[PDB]
Design a binder for this molecule. Structure first.
Ligand SMILES: Cc1cc2nc3c(=O)[nH]c(=O)nc-3n(C[C@H](O)[C@H](O)[C@H](O)COP(=O)(O)OP(=O)(O)OC[C@H]3O[C@@H](n4cnc5c(N)ncnc54)[C@H](O)[C@@H]3O)c2cc1C
Ligand SMILES: Cc1cc2nc3c(=O)[nH]c(=O)nc-3n(C[C@H](O)[C@H](O)[C@H](O)COP(=O)(O)OP(=O)(O)OC[C@H]3O[C@@H](n4cnc5c(N)ncnc54)[C@H](O)[C@@H]3O)c2cc1C
Ligand SMILES: O=S([O-])[O-]
Ligand SMILES: O=S([O-])[O-]
Lengths: 394, 394
């Protein structure tokens, strides 16, 4: 096979990059290790930044989102028995966020790519990258019992955290930054109407809780739990009782509960690699970084990494400004670090950390009080939550 | 589940460690991501050092090897149209090597573990390590549609180069050393009688070639080829013709050729991580290092890593000398580096490297001439080939 941009991974990052390149007339091929149904079987949430919403529209894959997505003009943080609303729209000047799951976005992108006949090779086993520092890099993989070669000009590693792309870069060139939080999130998805039209992030002595939604009849809730917790020890009844205990009475009081459609515990961690490229290989999305779910920035960083790569690739192909690609990592990292910082801040002020002393507890309560009670403070939250402005490049 | 030593990986390293611990009465459980047939489907060669042969006997899994294995008292290196024999037995004082494939060794270990009822969980998906720096580390994984927890005292990461164990150690604690050679090995396995009763490593202007064997009616041959070569462009006829062109006439002349049972190109690379442990987790085999096939040290290092870990675990459990486990990496690395060095030397003197000048070519020919023409030189080769003596520990 032969293309211009080889793409490893058919998750959100790879599909979005591929659809953007497709519309731009830049040849591209996506190689995915799993099957279509396997990828779609991954149930993942999503709170889309304005930048991502705009990118999906630019990619021509927004019809479903415009119909099934939930546009939120604000978000609330609860603590000390009170609900504090952050007016994202007002504070940002018009920006909002859209609650539409990664799973749905992935589904939409796959239907769009399948419809236009773009190239996607599923069940591409043993993917391997070659001659990355040359002008003719290529990829090899096995399919239907045969080895194939894919020649290209560039390679976009969009293969996630456990992909092969990040592992294909000499360890000497990379620097890893990481942190694991001392707790996980026990989530419960149910066919019940949400308790609020907007999300509710709750800080409570017993621990963090979050009220989210999927539709008028489907809701998603979470409560923080220690690392060693087993989902088996958490019946729906126990979850509902603990969730209510961490929410203001007025909220817990009007909460509609019911059987769970799915329950699971997920850890919270951060990870960033520098740089995010090597020769003709460029990493994007989870292949380069991880963030905790608190700020819902994972899916959004995948989008911003792709946007940047796409725009630089355009400059290379249409302006012969290929040297600009050298700036890919520096640009993405500035945004990734700010997202990691905001995600870290949100995690720090909303959760109960083990072995915390009285002073720390008071500092945390004061952080919430100050930020939610100041216009400047509220602004820092709002501008970060809807997503900081994309860097124009150059 | 609950055991004393949790083992990740049911390849040679994990199975051997597990069988050794089984006989010692130390509880152990092996978690393997793939199925039994998948593991056995990996066709891998093997030239066993005396130390490994002794270890398999100690493990009580040597009957098949004693019957089907080929004991070699010497090995030959050909160059400049002449065959030079290295009398391993004489030079080492009695040590030899046994040609018996990794695949056969793995098969033997699996039959032995299955027979004694030791615990092995195949298709163990999403393996994850936990609380490595505590006194109660544990592992989690999914099976038959359910999440399970395995408590233990120690964890042996025997999950290979692309395993999760090495990736479970903070990047800040690790230092990676690596090298990729500018060529690969095109191998051809056939049901033909070998051209020699001992191996023949050949250095020739056109490139490296190797004559090996599996039995009186089965042979394995290799010729070096550039990185970008496709096995598809190499018919059996072309392989046989190139192989002969790289061997002394007397050898090429008596070579029996025939249809290949299997053909493939494999790269040559080296990789070492320091340290090889973190808390209660200890890496062994490919999970910690890779060596080129030239010295056939890959399988042997897996064995020596296991031997060391096993002996240290014994000291911990039977002598309460658990502090000795702290020395695991230092001990293994001394042997790993010497094996990497010898493997590197063998690779350097036997292959044709791209863009080599006249001086390099002459230095290489002189290396062979000196080492094969000196008793001290021959000794350095012999002692390394049969395997240096295992470090006694402490
Ligand atoms: C339990 C959990 C909950 C999360 N919740 C949130 C949330 O609430 N909000 C949010 O924004 N983010 C959340 N995230 C993060 C978010 O899902 C990711 O940031 C997003 O999946 C990144 O997309 P990606 O395409 O970069 O990577 P992925 O979605 O991982 O896609 C990568 C693709 O590459 C393929 N691949 C891997 N290796 C290879 C290979 N060798 N060859 C070929 N293909 C390969 C994979 O099969 C996969 O399809 C969560 C993550 C987890 C684990
Ligand atoms: C093409 C090729 C040719 C080679 N030729 C030679 C040769 O001629 N001579 C020589 O000595 N060596 C050779 N080697 C090297 C040799 O095969 C290895 O050194 C040996 O396989 C190492 O054994 P191991 O048990 O440490 O790892 P492996 O054999 O890789 O076994 C690791 C096991 O862990 C499992 N695993 C991986 N990830 C997970 C996870 N997340 N959870 C659970 N289980 C997991 C794997 O499925 C596997 O079964 C060759 C290698 C290759 C690739
Ligand atoms: O199921 S598929 O398209 O390989
Ligand atoms: O095929 S098995 O034993 O999981």
């Amino acid at each position: 096979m032969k293309t211009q941009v080889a793409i490893i991974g058919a998750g959100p990052s790879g599909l979005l990059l591929g659809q953007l390149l497709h519309k731009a007339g830049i040849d591209n091929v996506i190689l995915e290790r799993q099957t279509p149904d396997y990828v779609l079987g991954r149930i993942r949430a999503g709170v889309l930044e304005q930048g991502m919403v705009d990118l999906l529209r630019e990619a021509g894959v927004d019809r479903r989102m415009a119909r099934d997505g939930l546009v939120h003009e604000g978000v609330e943080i609860a603590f000390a028995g009170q609900r504090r609303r952050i007016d994202l729209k007002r504070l940002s000047g018009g920006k909002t966020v859209t609650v539409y799951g990664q799973t749905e976005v992935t589904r939409d992108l796959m239907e769009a790519r399948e419809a236009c006949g773009a190239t996607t090779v599923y069940q591409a086993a043993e993917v391997r990258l070659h001659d990355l520092q040359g002008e003719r890099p290529y990829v090899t993989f096995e399919r239907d019992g045969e080895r194939l070669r894919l020649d290209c000009d560039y390679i976009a590693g969009c293969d996630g955290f456990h992909g092969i792309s990040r592992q294909s870069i000499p360890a000497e060139r990379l620097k890893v930054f990481e942190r694991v939080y001392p707790f996980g999130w026990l989530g419960l998805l149910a066919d019940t109407p949400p308790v609020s039209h907007e999300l509710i992030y709750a800080n409570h002595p017993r621990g963090f809780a979050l009220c989210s939604q999927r539709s008028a009849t489907r809701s998603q809730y979470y409560v923080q739990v220690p690392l060693s917790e087993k989902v088996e020890d958490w019946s729906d009844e126990r979850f509902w009782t603990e969730l209510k205990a961490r929410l203001p009475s007025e909220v817990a009081e009007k909460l509609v509960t019911g059987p769970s459609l799915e329950k699971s515990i997920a850890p919270l961690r951060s990870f960033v690699v520098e740089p995010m490229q090597h020769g003709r290989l460029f990493l994007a999305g989870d292949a380069a970084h991880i963030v905790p779910p608190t700020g819902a920035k994972g899916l959004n960083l995948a989008a911003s990494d792709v946007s940047t790569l796409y725009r630089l690739l355009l400059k290379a192909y249409r302006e012969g400004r290929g040297e600009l690609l050298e700036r890919y990592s520096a640009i993405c990292l500035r945004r990734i670090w700010k997202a990691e910082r905001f995600s870290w801040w949100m995690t720090s002020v909303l959760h109960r950390f083990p072995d915390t002393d009285a002073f720390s507890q008071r500092i945390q309560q004061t952080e919430l009080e100050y930020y939610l009670g100041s216009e400047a403070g509220l602004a820092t939250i709002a501008e970060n939550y809807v997503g900081l402005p994309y860097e124009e490049i150059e």
